[PDB]
Amino acid sequence: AVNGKGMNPDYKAYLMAPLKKIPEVTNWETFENDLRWAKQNGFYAIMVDFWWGDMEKNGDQQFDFSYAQRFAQSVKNAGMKMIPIISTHQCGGNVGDDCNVPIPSWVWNQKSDDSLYFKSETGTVNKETLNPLASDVIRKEYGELYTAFAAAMKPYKDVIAKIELSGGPAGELRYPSYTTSDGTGYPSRGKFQAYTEFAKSKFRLWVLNKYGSLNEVNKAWGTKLISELAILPPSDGEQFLMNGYLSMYGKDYLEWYQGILENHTKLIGELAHNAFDTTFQVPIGAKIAGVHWQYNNPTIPHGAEKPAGYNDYSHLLDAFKSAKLDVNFTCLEMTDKGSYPEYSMPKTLVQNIATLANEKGIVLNGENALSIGNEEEYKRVAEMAFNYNFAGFTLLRYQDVMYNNSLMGKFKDLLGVTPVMQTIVVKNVPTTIGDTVYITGNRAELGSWDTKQYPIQLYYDSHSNDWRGNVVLPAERNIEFKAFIKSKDGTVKSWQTIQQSWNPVPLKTTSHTSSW
């Protein structure tokens, strides 16, 4: 893996449940059998949406966790684990959505202003999820929902492996900047979503709080604003994305804009921890979308990410570390293109997020953005997952492998692996002062024969005079590998004479000794 390390010893594969409730797909008996089958193919747990629209449909404090409870019961009967996603967003309307579960209708009556929803550059209103600006309403509702959920699911604490929170549209921490109705669907530029009166008002106050008075504002922005009312979000999102973002106004606007999501992250992280830490004691995470289009567009750089709220990923991730939330990213199955007209760079994006997350020490999880119908995509996921220290991978979605045996088989081999620590020993290596020995092999967990970025470093043993090291490997899979020497300058000097192999890697920890 990167930095001479191996794969993450805690890696686990999860299966995304269907969008429709199980009873709308099959019966519980078959479901339990499907779970037992998934478990046999390497899946540790099933991740599932529990919609707010279902749990608190009738009215405030009128909860119904019966479906959730019945679901967990079958997961228990099947000896599986589950990861509930407390989906406080709407189901249906997004790409590939085969459902219709809007959030409780009554929640909208809690305000007379336009503080609860979103409004785009061109006036399009969106109600897929509560506007994170309404932190007072969010604190109350999420707070009550989370605590009610914890109590209702207490009997199933043993089958809950982790809990995922919904931070916005499609359960992702972002603004609803790419939608059909707003004319911003992939792969077009996104539209800023801060045009409600309430949003304008908050930005205005934030600016004034930062500089004190209009005069200081004008001084900092180098503008000639006539009055406080002239402080507004961009009038033209396209011109703003073309070069306005470069000005001091631009930087302030984007800071505030992304800042709303960061504060939201801290808020739900606090509520979640207060509600679950004692009862469940399981990790809590949230999702970051993979807005890969318009990434390298020369005219409107990062023209899709910025409107979505993603301007500075480093700063964004700090909010996660701060809230004590693990991160779940996507687009692990895609490769870079970067050509007109999509200017898509998903892999570069993933590499960047992973690196940042690793540096900050944030537990990293991932998913595939679109359905995978070919083995090649599994390899892409494997390459990313096993070389950038991912702790978990969730496959979307259930039916794709559950009803396709050959596909399910390719996943078991490539992704449904169980990491096991093994000792690799290499004798008689003709190393000279300055050299270091690494191993690289055929599987992604071994760098896929890469000597540049992913080789796994070994350590010299001055007592037995050989090179060794404890490496994490995929249990019960066949591997081939060879050690090689790297110069002080990083040049590959030579390779082990004969290619080694382990068919397969044993399930118990032991050692593989070979000679140069």
Ligand X SMILES: OC[C@H]1O[C@H](O[C@H]2[C@H](O)[C@@H](O)[C@@H](O)O[C@@H]2CO)[C@H](O)[C@@H](O)[C@@H]1O
Ligand Y SMILES: OC[C@H]1O[C@H](O[C@H]2[C@H](O)[C@@H](O)[C@H](O)O[C@@H]2CO)[C@H](O)[C@@H](O)[C@@H]1O
Please tell me the distance from the alpha carbon of residue 90 to that of residue 105, in angstroms, as a whole number.
Answer: 11
Cα of first residue to Cα of last residue in the chain, in angstroms, is: 22
Residue 171 binding partner per list Ca ion, ligand X, ligand Y, none, with a CB distance cut-off of 5 to 8 Å that depends on partner kind: ligand Y
Establish whether 367 is a catalytic residue.
yes
Residue 16 binding partner per list ligand X, ligand Y, Ca ion, none, with a CB distance cut-off of 5 to 8 Å that depends on partner kind: ligand Y
Determine which residue in the list 4, 244, 259, 506 makes contact with ligand X, applying CB under 6 A.
244
Residue 190 binding partner per list Ca ion, ligand X, ligand Y, none, with a CB distance cut-off of 5 to 8 Å that depends on partner kind: none
Give the residue numbers of the binding site: 49, 56, 60-61, 89, 97, 141, 144, 287, 292, 330, 368-369, 397
Q: Tell me whether residue 149 or residue 393 sits nearer to ligand X (CB atom).
A: 393
Please tell me the distance from the alpha carbon of residue 417 to that of residue 409, in angstroms, as a whole number.
Answer: 12
> Is position 75 an interface residue for ligand Y (rule: CB under 6 A)?
no
Helix (H/G/I), strand (E/B), else coil: 231: coil
Residue 79 Ramachandran class (φ > 0 left, ψ -120 to 50 alpha, else beta): left
Determine which residue in the list 102, 234, 416, 474 makes contact with ligand X, applying CB under 6 A.
234
Residues 449-488 that bind ligand X (CB under 6 A): 449, 482
Q: 172 φ, ψ to 5°?
A: -110, 145
> Is position 185 an interface residue for ligand Y (rule: CB under 6 A)?
no
> Is position 257 an interface residue for ligand X (rule: CB under 6 A)?
no
Give the residue numbers of the binding site for Ca(2+): 56, 60-61, 141, 144
Q: How many CB atoms lie within 10 A of CB 22?
A: 20
Q: 61 φ, ψ to 5°?
A: 70, 10
Q: Tell me whether residue 49 or residue 435 sits nearer to ligand Y (CB atom).
A: 49
> Is position 230 an interface residue for ligand X (rule: CB under 6 A)?
yes
Determine which residue in the list 114, 144, 238, 336 makes contact with Ca ion, applying CB under 5 A.
144
> Is position 235 an interface residue for ligand X (rule: CB under 6 A)?
yes
Please tell me the distance from the alpha carbon of residue 378 to that of residue 414, in angstroms, as a whole number.
Answer: 7
Whether the Cβ atoms of residue 54 and residue 64 lie closer than 8 Å to each other: yes
The minimum distance between CB 141 and Ca ion, in angstroms, equals: 5
Helical packing angle, 375-387 and 405-414, nearest 10°: 20
The minimum distance between CB 102 and ligand X, in angstroms, equals: 16
Residues 87-106 that bind ligand Y (CB under 6 A): 87, 89, 91, 94-97
> Is position 499 an interface residue for ligand X (rule: CB under 6 A)?
yes
Torsion of CA 388, 484, 508, 380, to 10 degrees: 30
The minimum distance between CB 142 and Ca ion, in angstroms, equals: 9
The minimum distance between CB 415 and ligand X, in angstroms, equals: 18
Establish whether 172 is a catalytic residue.
yes
Three-state DSSP string of 150-184 = HHHHHHHHHHECCEEECCCHHHECCCCCCCCCCCC
Q: What is the set of active-site residues?
A: 172, 367
